A paper describes a structure:
One family, the ferric uptake regulator ([name]) family of metalloregulators, is involved in the regulation of iron, manganese, zinc and nickel homeostasis through the activity of [name], Mur (manganese uptake regulator), Zur (zinc uptake regulator) and Nur (nickel uptake regulator) proteins, respectively. Previous structural studies of members of the [name] family of proteins revealed that these transcription factors fold into two distinct domains, including a DNA binding domain (DBD) and a dimerization domain (DD) localized on the N- and C-terminus of the protein, respectively. The third metal binding pocket is the regulatory site (S2) and is composed of residues located in a region referred to as the hinge, which links the DBD and DD.
To further understand the role of the S3 site in CjFur DNA binding activity, we carried out crystallization trials to solve the structure of the wild-type transcription factor devoid of metal in its S3 site. Instead, four water molecules establish several hydrogen bonds with residues forming the S3 sites. Altogether, these observations show that the DBD can undergo asymmetric reorganization when the S3 site is not metalated.
Numbering used by the authors:
A (entry chain A): 8 to 64, 66 to 91, 94 to 154
B (entry chain B): 4 to 89, 95 to 159
Write the structure that this text describes.
């Protein structure tokens, strides 16, 4: 079972870097991995001090600050100021999708009874729910 | 339909097909890719001949050969990605659970929820679709990881 959200994020980060003439270095890999895996919301300073403590490889604060800006610009992370900006992964609300296997037709939908059961499932297992992915597959009326 | 949604279950199938080919020392070619794509995007239970003829009609530029059609089907059958009768083939579409993933430690919880299942059947009926499958992943942070740095 692969984590689709993480796989998507990692490919998008690499796509952006290839487009900017930049390499997927071990510094950049640990930065994205830290922001995805940690449940602490970092400032550029605390992200830089955290990676210093976990990986004295590198990595300087300039590299941290440029990588956060590339991520925010791409809307892969969101920042919030309050008095150093704190960052977290973007979890923009999105619709779910049903896809016709035969013609590729895509129908968007959102269902509040499903939404409510998804929060209940997280809660039954002690999880804090942060995102979801839900696709339905079938054959549309015109293809059938 | 103006929207780019990657079909996750199809990508999982293609990755498994790539794994099989690499195991059998075969290159992942456009000819082999179009065969898996035809099996998935159709309800027909093809035979090697009818699958050859369908690809010839739909993608004549690729010139997919009959030897490649049999060889690929035999490879997919040995891997249990397809089942056959007498031969006529059907892609395996085995029941599966839904999964919840901790973003920090990566632990996975498998689950099924009957309320969600019923809503999925109603959604499909409301749009005149015949439901054949689904995929649902929930993302979150487990009780061991909550407010913790990266494990
Ligand atoms: Zn259709
Ligand atoms: Zn965890």
């Amino acid at each position: 079972i692969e984590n689709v959200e993480y796989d998507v994020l990692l490919e998008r980060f690499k796509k952006i870097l290839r487009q900017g003439g930049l390499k997927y270095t071990k510094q950049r890999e640990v930065l994205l991995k830290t922001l995805y895996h940690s449940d602490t919301h970092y400032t550029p300073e605390s992200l830089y001090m955290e990676i210093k403590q976990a990986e004295p490889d590198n990595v300087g604060i300039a590299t941290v600050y440029r990588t956060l800006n590339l991520l925010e610009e791409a809307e892969m992370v969101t920042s919030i100021s309050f008095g150093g900006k704190k960052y977290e992964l973007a979890n923009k609300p999105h619709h779910d999708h049903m896809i016709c296997k035969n013609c590729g037709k895509i129908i968007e939908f959102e269902n509040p009874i499903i939404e409510r059961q998804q929060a209940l499932i997280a809660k039954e297992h002690g999880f804090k729910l942060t995102g979801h992915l839900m696709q339905l597959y079938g054959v549309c009326g015109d293809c059938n």
